[PDB]
Amino acid sequence: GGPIKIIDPEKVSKEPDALLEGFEWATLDLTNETELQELWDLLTYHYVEDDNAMFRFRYSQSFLHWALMSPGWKKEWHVGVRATKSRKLVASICGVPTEINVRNQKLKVVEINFLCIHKKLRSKRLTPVLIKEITRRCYLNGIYQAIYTAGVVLPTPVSSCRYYHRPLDWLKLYEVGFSPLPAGSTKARQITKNHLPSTTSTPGLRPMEPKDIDTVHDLLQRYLSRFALNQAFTREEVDHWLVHKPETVKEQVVWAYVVEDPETHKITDFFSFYNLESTVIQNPKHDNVRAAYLYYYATETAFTNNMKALKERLLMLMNDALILAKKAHFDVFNALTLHDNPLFLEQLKFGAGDGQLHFYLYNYRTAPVPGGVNEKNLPDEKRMGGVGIVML
Template sequence: MAPILLDEIKRRYCLSGRFQAVFVSKVAVAKPIATCRYWQRPLNPEKLINAGILRLSRSITCKQALNLYELTCQETDLLLPKIKVLGKHHLVSAFSLFTQYSEKHDLTACFTLTEFEHMFMPRSEIVYTYVIENDKEVTDFVSFYCLPMILPNNGIEYVIRTAYSLYNIAATVPLDQLLKAIMSIATKNNIDAFTVTDAMENSAACLEKLCFSKVDGLHFITFSTTGSVLG
């Protein structure tokens, strides 16, 4: 079904007068120019266990799982007060930081300031964006969006809210500390699981340190373009 849906989206897109694009797919419906992998971490392990999503091995109890995925630590407690919700007064500085960061990568989205505002300004229970500011200059930037799903299990319907990381720009703090603080904030926003891709600076070593586990692969595919596979 996915290839048929993609063909229809491409057809409608071309009718708008635009003929090149990048899309992502879990299935390699065409030769991808880049491939990465989703990694996921429970934020509310007890709920995920009850919903049947998180299955524990026989050697791990529920209490041990809760301790394993605990996010509270001294570094996080010190960092949290510095993290602010993105506001309109941050936009120009955040856009400048994002643009400089994007230029370091071979494949990236290009936004105007207006598009950046539309994409990243927080929207209740949909888009979450946070910054760290120093002397009124944004130095660090994190954004994710939330997708809820209803999952029935044993006669109970569980609403599972999963965060999907968009960008993590850590310039003044270690990335693992920034991600841990952001996941703590996500937990306070009733998010049950956190998902990132091992793209850009999100290395496997960093994600394993934070108790993420590998899940699905993700392929980046272009149409009406030519180029080499990105490393």
């Protein structure tokens, strides 16, 4: 495929379009703690809810710092709208730069995230106005393509993936209304079903350390290249997205583990997962669901091109991930059908979700890509090799 249109740099407007009366554009400076707070206040009460109004995503301030100030980031791409009189932040749309591979073409893009409109300004056609203004701001900086995911269907998706959920603390997920009691069964039998080992089983598995950066970078890129659509990681991005920094990050967001070969001492696998709570909206017993999401991972056994061998190693690596997540007090472990994940989701007892994530490319045309599912929307080993990028 290829780009849909060429942008004339000389016709990109210097000033933004007009906004609804009483409102004005504002560039957010998220190094300023009050503005980061303002953004957190908007998202906490106005961001992504499920269709039953039971859970709302609760990105923490530390997550946002991490997600929005990654290598190459520009404040010009953190876009707000404020009420002119109260100065209150009522809408947002953000991007960060990265490079992607789309069928062996390498593309400079922005990843678009955190589109949010205060509930009281909904249904006023403000979204197209947000979208068009961040577009202009990117165009001024020499970026002309974007990638994004959404829960809703818009023109020409590149792929689609289903959410899966492996219960770590089943009872709490039972009390919040998330997990069913099905149907001639017992709390105890469900806890039994979900009970995990207390120690990990992969030989040489330890926490990732800064010294592992170069070797993990190399393994990740090799693995990711087995996917038609992937993130082309830099060294700095491996550092930023995978290596938690104790001294500077007060609330930990990223968790990475490597597999040091007991004999050769070369890293042969790694996996990672991040922390993203949901607010439980109307609930007596509980306030908070603590969720871990599967992130990037890689394994040398994938290059043996033996699908049975890969299944074996992933079944073991991922079950250690569950055990480690449980140990860090997470209530549920979430994954999508992207990567080689259909090889293990069901067998490790993830239950199919109702959530769907659709993937989009702006100003770039390419043939559809497999999302790990089939025409019944259930995991399928023949339908992988497509989506290799995970977006927050």
